[PDB]
Design a protein around this ligand. Structure first.
Ligand SMILES: Nc1ncnc2c1ncn2[C@@H]1O[C@H](COP(=O)(O)OP(=O)(O)OP(=O)(O)O)[C@@H](O)[C@H]1O
Ligand SMILES: Nc1ncnc2c1ncn2[C@@H]1O[C@H](COP(=O)(O)OP(=O)(O)OP(=O)(O)O)[C@@H](O)[C@H]1O
Ligand SMILES: [Cl-]
Ligand SMILES: [Cl-]
Ligand SMILES: [Cl-]
Ligand SMILES: [Cl-]
Ligand SMILES: [Cl-]
Ligand SMILES: [Cl-]
Ligand SMILES: [Mg+2]
Lengths: 365, 475
């Protein structure tokens, strides 16, 4: 199975729609495709070729989104390293992933990694002149993105294009799409909650509002300058309900398990969620209509859930197991884990939970 | 490779959303799943077994929706049949599909087919009871779900095998194109045995969206239905659109999308549509692509007169002549590609051979792309007329003949002489000098395209889908 490259096609369809807003600048999908194609050509100098793995160590910046896309446009597996890890946790992942290159800037030490992988500077690269024929097709089964978990030795999740597509498509079926929808990301892009938005973006043709970090003053401000409708966050960011109800603009906040009592019915629409690196973001959600159920919601469309071993009756504890086309086929270079992980199509999550009488998920600490 | 049954799962997730609105009687997804599972067990009692092929012959009713989902839950290929087919045409498709059963009702002549297939009556079937069964919990994406015959406009009708994969991707791409909300409802007033209508049944379970179902298109009933049930989406052909326009000042507030298939809307229909606030999405598509594969948003309606639009997300078009790709505006055959395109015809090897190149399907339509990639559909490759150094595209001519307004229906075929010369066949509102309107044609058409002779009739050779048979006007 295959699909024409999401970014390319998105550009051909609605070229002057806004892809990325970062700082105060704007990128159209026409620009984003042009950006990503340039970088892709400039990496092709440097000997980067189809089939290679390339790691990315960067903060949320326009140039990171180009970087992801330039990899796809080359056919390069991308590894997005967590910048808040120690340098050694990262060197482990570079060797384990088979990375031939690391793309980063001047805020990190390239000398700390040059001994393992050829090192490339984003800004110094953007200035170079280069000749290249892109990959117009994405294979739905090819790995797109290799993301690590971190609880034994972190396993490298092979996230396919297909996984990402079905993740985005299933989230739409669940929350709906709108031509004036805009998603705000104040979370790190190397984490899946933020990487998913990038793919949602090209697939829906939706705008993403990108912030390097979560500043309440600078976030609740750009929500109004830019009319954000969609925002994904953790409890901590939510905690900043300094003002106080929710703007008119916001129709959805996407979420660990909920704390105590909302706080606040008046007046934010908060969606609770259960997901993991292996499910390429959420697989289960709880609509604000029933904020007072617990606790995690029901399975997304096209996805499945059993609390099992074995197959447990309603309201009785067991091992949560997930299934669906948004779930990864296999960990990278983990034969033992792959066999241990999967029972007949299902993924053993290693989590404690049950389903109530109506089939809602309840995750346990 | 596999998904949970969309009806089951929809029933598990949002059990109290309205699935169906028929008459004004409403049916939930829980109720729909129940109805269907019920009907399923009943059918299983008639030796209807997983892997068989039940054909369905029904007017748009709730019981038809049940029957389609039932076949899914039993693992049975559902063949749906055009209820305006002649007995002969109908028996042909029953034989050719390898149908064992024919689910229908008393509105038809059951015993007239009782020799080829085990008939069954939808209503008398609902009355009985049988052993509960299971399940069938999973749709295999690459399995034929439904089998749908083309209209046979250009030869003996082909059976299109439409996979669950196909239907799923058709629903998803359309949603990427049009958006989807909780508040959305879709009104089908065209037959459910047409892909335009059937695909709404799948849009429903997958989105969890209410389908407002009508047994036929009566403009007053539609307008009432639209407002009473707060309909936001409607599928329509050019005549249905022209009628909704006549009977309104402004467009119903509830409506946000009118998906127009079947052919382009002429410029006056559109300006009136823009003046009156009608949001019209023109579209191109076929049975083989499981409804629309190309659409054009209202914003480009006037700017791109005569265009079907651009491909839906995940889908592709291209234009080829003699194996080579075509420059912008260069005429050639429309070819399509996508997860929503059927992978193969049912039992038509010659057609499968000649219609696929590399994942691409040859539609047998001629068209072109403009510099920006917008599609323009000309005409069927088969009804092309070559008056030497042609071409005359009969739809080009026919379009000008309509809007006389003397002309109500117009058709054009090629006679032969010293290469082929265009003849036109007209149905008349009023009387028209002939011509002028040859002069009426002269202004809006190059000299070689104008019809040499004009003939007159009361009806034109149409098949069971009201489609013009141009090869048979010479009669
Ligand atoms: N909202 C949530 N509520 C409860 N538990 C959660 C939630 N989100 C994630 N988890 C837990 O965290 C996991 C997802 O995190 P991730 O997969 O990135 O790391 P991990 O699975 O903890 O680490 P490892 O690589 O060792 O498997 C899930 O297995 C789940 O058990
Ligand atoms: N927007 C449009 N503009 C112009 N022509 C269209 C448009 N939409 C559909 N068509 C025509 O309608 C055809 C689809 O018809 P359908 O598949 O329902 O039966 P059929 O293809 O005519 O029959 P067969 O191929 O078996 O002879 C397309 O091939 C195309 O020729
Ligand atoms: Cl645009
Ligand atoms: Cl959209
Ligand atoms: Cl519900
Ligand atoms: Cl599609
Ligand atoms: Cl929805
Ligand atoms: Cl001549
Ligand atoms: Mg055809």
């Amino acid at each position: 199975t295959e699909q024409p490259n999401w970014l390319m096609q998105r550009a051909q369809l609605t070229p002057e729609r806004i892809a990325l807003i970062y700082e105060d600048q704007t990128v159209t999908f026409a620009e984003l495709f042009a950006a990503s194609k340039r970088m892709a050509e400039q990496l092709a100098a440097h000997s980067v070729r189809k089939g290679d793995t390339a790691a990315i160590l960067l903060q949320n910046r326009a140039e990171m989104v180009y970087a992801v896309h330039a990899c796809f446009l080359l056919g390069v597996k991308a590894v997005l390293l967590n910048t808040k890890l120690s340098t050694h946790e990262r060197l482990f992942q570079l060797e384990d992933s088979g990375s031939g290159f690391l793309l980063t800037d001047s805020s990190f030490e390239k000398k700390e990694y040059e001994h393992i992988v050829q090192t490339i500077d984003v800004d110094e690269l953007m200035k170079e002149a280069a000749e290249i024929e892109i990959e117009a097709y994405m294979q739905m089964d090819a790995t797109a993105t290799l993301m690590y978990t971190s609880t034994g030795k972190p396993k490298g999740v092979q996230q396919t294009f297909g996984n990402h597509y079905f993740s985005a498509v299933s989230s739409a079926l669940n929350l709906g799409i709108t031509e004036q929808d805009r998603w705000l990301i104040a979370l790190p892009l190397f984490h899946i909650s933020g990487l998913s938005a990038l793919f949602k973006s090209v697939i829906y043709g939706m705008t993403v509002v990108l912030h390097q970090r979560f500043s309440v003053s600078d976030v609740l401000h750009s929500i109004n300058r830019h009319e954000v409708t969609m925002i994904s966050a953790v409890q901590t960011m939510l905690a900043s309900l300094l003002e106080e109800r929710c703007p008119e603009s916001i129709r959805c906040i996407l979420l660990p398990l909920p704390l105590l009592e909302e706080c606040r019915e008046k007046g934010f629409p908060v969606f609770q969620s259960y997901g993991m690196t292996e499910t390429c973001s959420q697989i289960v959600t709880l609509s604000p209509e029933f904020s007072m159920e617990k606790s995690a919601g029901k399975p997304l469309f096209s996805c499945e859930i059993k609390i099992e071993g074995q197959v447990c009756e309603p309201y009785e504890h067991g091992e949560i197991m997930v299934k669906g086309p948004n779930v990864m086929k296999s960990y990278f270079n983990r034969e033992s884990a792959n066999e241990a992980s999967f029972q007949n199509g299902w993924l053993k999550t290693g989590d404690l939970g049950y389903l109530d009488n109506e089939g809602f998920l309840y995750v346990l600490d």
